[PDB]
C-alpha cells in the first residue's frame, strides 16, 4: 500500500501533522477487487476520506461493523493460531484507515478492546465459535458503550434542565441532540441557541434536528457568541475525548466557547461516555491535532474568491484545524453514564475500569 | 463654642449632606469674621475645620474643609488686598454653594441612563445619591428590581428599602453575609461614597469592599456615584493605612480603583484615573 501524499504547504507550527487533500485518494493505486486490504476496509477508508462519515460515535460504529464483517470473512491459515494471526492481520487495515483519515479516540479505544478480546481467545476454541463470540462481544460493546451509555446520560442531564432555560449548544453532537429531544419529550420547556462555525457548518445538522422535534431554536455564528451569551442560562458542549489530565479534546470551537462563557458567569457542561476516556494527556492543540483540506477555507463573497489561487503566493499558508483542547478549570460539570462527576475524576473512571 | 451649634442646626435639611453643611458653616464664619489679615483668617478657619471634623468624624467633612482652604488660597493669590479679596471670596463662596447644592440632580441625570429595563441593581447602604438616581430612573418609565444589604452596624438598608417602597420599586432586603449569594442574580452594583482617594478608590461603609471583590469575581459592573467635594488627597496602601479618625468595629473602609468601573460626579462620567488628574490640576 503506497503512502498518501501531502497537499499544499503546511504551517511551520503544524509541520509535524499530515495534511491531505479530499480530491485525491489511495484507491487509484490499488486493486479494483481488493486483495491486500479487505473490501469492507477499503469502503470504510473511502467513506472516511470523502467525509461521508464525519462524526465520532458513527465512525466507531462503522469501524466495528467493518471489523465484524472482516472477522466473518476471516479464515485462519494452517499451522497458525487465531489469537496471533488475527491481530497481525488487522494491523495493515488500521494503518490504511489511518492513512485515509487520522483515527479518533473512540476508534482507538475500540481497536484496543477488540485486540484484547482477540488475544484473550483460548487455543482449544473452534474457529466458527470464536468468530461468533467475537461478533457477539462487538455487539455487546456497541450496545452497552454507546446505546445504553446514552440513555443514562440523557436521564442524568434531565434533572439539570429547568423550565425557561436557555441552553447554548455548539456544532453537531449525537448525545447533545438526544438529550435535548428527550428533555423536550419528558415535559421540559426551554429554548436552544445553536452555534456554528466554518467550513463544516455541521451545526445545521442539529438545528434542523430540533425544529423537527418542536424545540424553539436560534442560529448564529461563533464570532457572535459574546452577544448572545448574556441571555444564555447554561452551555451544553459535546466531547470527542476526555484526557487523563482533565482536559477536553473536542471540535476547535469548544475551548473558545468555554472561555467566553466563563466571562459571563454561564455554567459549562460537558457530556461524554466512559469509553472515550484517554489515558494520555495533552496541554495544547499543537502537539496532536488534525489538518483537514486547506481548500475548504475558500468562500465566494460577492463576485470573486479571495483565496482562489493561494498556492501561487509563496508565503501564504492556510490553516484548517479540526480539534482543540480545553483546560479543566473552564469545565464545571461532566455528565457520564456513572453519574455527574467533576472534571478531575477522569483518572478515577480510568482506574475503576 | 457656637460653631458646633450652627453646624448641627444646619443639618435640619434631611437632604443636605454633612460636607455641604460644614462648607456653609465655614462660609458663614468667614462672613462674620472680624479679622484684618489673611493669615489670621486662614488659621482661624483651619482650627474651625479641625473642630468640625472633631464633631463629625466623616471623610466628607475633611474633604470639604480642604476644598474650602484651597479655594481660600486660590482667591488670596489673585487680589492681595483682603478687602476686595474678601468680597471676591464671599461672592465666589455664594456661587460655589449654589452650584454644589444642585450636583446630586446632575449626577442623577447623567447616571440614570446606564440602568436598563428589567435589570437588577445592588446597593449596600442608604445614600441620597443612589436614591436620587433611582428616582430619576423610575421617572423615565423604567422597571427594575433593587437588592440592598442591611448594613448591620446601623440598619440603613431597611431605611433605604422603606424610602424606595414609596417610589413603587420592588426592593428586597438581604443580609450582609448573603452578598456573595445574590451576586449572581444582580446585573449591576451601584454604591455611594464618602470620600474618593487620590488613585481612584473610594472610602465607604465597612461592607462595601467585600462587595466590590465578589462582583469582580463575577465580572459584574460596579459604579460609584459621588459628588465633587468628596475628592480628598489620601493614599491608603491597605485597610490599615486608613486614618483612625475616619474608621472610628470599623465604621468605614477603603476600596481600590481596580474594582471600580465608573464614577458619576457632577463633572460627568469619569474613570478612576480622572480623580488624580483633577486633584493635580487643583494643586490642593
CSV table of N, CA and C in Angstrom, one decimal, chain A residues 262-265, chain B residues 217-220:
chain,number,residue,atom,x,y,z
A,262,UNK,N,-17.2,31.7,30.5
A,262,UNK,CA,-16.7,31.9,31.9
A,262,UNK,C,-16.8,33.4,32.2
A,263,UNK,N,-16.6,34.3,31.2
A,263,UNK,CA,-16.6,35.7,31.4
A,263,UNK,C,-18.1,36.2,31.6
A,264,UNK,N,-19.1,35.4,31.4
A,264,UNK,CA,-20.5,35.8,31.6
A,264,UNK,C,-21.2,35.0,32.7
A,265,UNK,N,-20.4,34.3,33.5
A,265,UNK,CA,-20.9,33.5,34.6
A,265,UNK,C,-22.0,32.5,34.2
B,217,UNK,N,-15.1,39.1,40.9
B,217,UNK,CA,-15.0,37.6,40.6
B,217,UNK,C,-16.1,37.2,39.7
B,218,UNK,N,-17.1,38.0,39.4
B,218,UNK,CA,-18.2,37.6,38.5
B,218,UNK,C,-18.4,38.6,37.4
B,219,UNK,N,-17.4,39.5,37.2
B,219,UNK,CA,-17.4,40.5,36.1
B,219,UNK,C,-18.7,41.3,36.1
B,220,UNK,N,-19.2,41.6,37.3
B,220,UNK,CA,-20.4,42.5,37.4
B,220,UNK,C,-20.0,43.9,37.4
